[PDB]
Design an enzyme around this catalytic site. Structure first.
Site, short mmCIF file in Angstrom:
data_model
loop_
_atom_site.label_atom_id
_atom_site.label_comp_id
_atom_site.label_asym_id
_atom_site.label_seq_id
_atom_site.Cartn_x
_atom_site.Cartn_y
_atom_site.Cartn_z
N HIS A 12 0.77 -1.28 0.00
CA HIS A 12 0.00 0.00 0.00
C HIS A 12 0.79 1.32 0.00
CE1 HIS A 12 -3.68 -2.24 0.29
NE2 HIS A 12 -3.23 -2.91 1.36
N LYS A 41 -4.87 -10.01 -7.68
CA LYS A 41 -5.61 -9.31 -6.61
C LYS A 41 -6.59 -8.36 -7.30
CE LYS A 41 -5.03 -7.01 -2.21
NZ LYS A 41 -4.99 -5.57 -1.91
N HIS A 119 -3.30 -2.67 7.84
CA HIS A 119 -4.40 -3.00 6.91
C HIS A 119 -4.91 -1.69 6.34
CE1 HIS A 119 -8.25 -4.65 5.51
NE2 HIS A 119 -8.85 -3.68 6.26
N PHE A 120 -5.17 -1.67 5.04
CA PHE A 120 -5.83 -0.54 4.37
C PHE A 120 -7.31 -0.86 4.33
CE2 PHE A 120 -7.36 2.21 1.12
CZ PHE A 120 -6.63 3.36 1.33
N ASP A 121 -8.12 -0.09 5.01
CA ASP A 121 -9.55 -0.45 5.13
C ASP A 121 -10.40 0.21 4.04
OD1 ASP A 121 -11.13 -2.24 6.79
OD2 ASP A 121 -12.23 -0.46 7.38
#
Length: 124
Positions: A12, A41, A119-121
């Site tokens: 990210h 992905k 984590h990229f939410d």
């Protein structure tokens, strides 16, 4: 093995440019960051801000995560991001993406000591 914090930087972070380098950006970056190794992905976001600036989001606006956990944080400022979205034409192992540039608030999940993004939410 790969730490969650290291996995977040790989998946990210792209501080090296200020915007979506080109129409080719996602095709090249999804490959070079190994997000097409075992399958395309489908979606991924890269953030074009300093590591320090993204790590600082862990002390910003506390918001609920999409999975219902409480450890997500929304950036007070908009950040330069690139969304990668797999095409219909895309067939593994030749993964193909639309590159979309935007300025949005990011939402990240943070964990650990030190307390860092893992984590990229979402972007909003």
């Amino acid at each position: 093995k790969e730490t969650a914090a290291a996995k977040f930087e790989r998946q990210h972070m792209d501080s090296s440019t200020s915007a979506a380098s080109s129409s080719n950006y996602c095709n090249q970056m999804m490959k070079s960051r190994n997000l097409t190794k075992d399958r395309c992905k489908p979606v991924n976001t890269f953030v074009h801000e300093s590591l320090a600036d993204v790590q600082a989001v862990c002390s910003q606006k506390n918001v609920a995560c999409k999975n219902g956990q409480t450890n997500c944080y929304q950036s007070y400022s908009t950040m330069s991001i690139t969304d990668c979205r797999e095409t219909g034409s895309s067939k593994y192992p030749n993964c193909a993406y639309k590159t979309t540039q935007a300025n949005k608030h990011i939402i990240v999940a943070c964990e650990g000591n030190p307390y860092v993004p893992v984590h990229f939410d979402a972007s909003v």
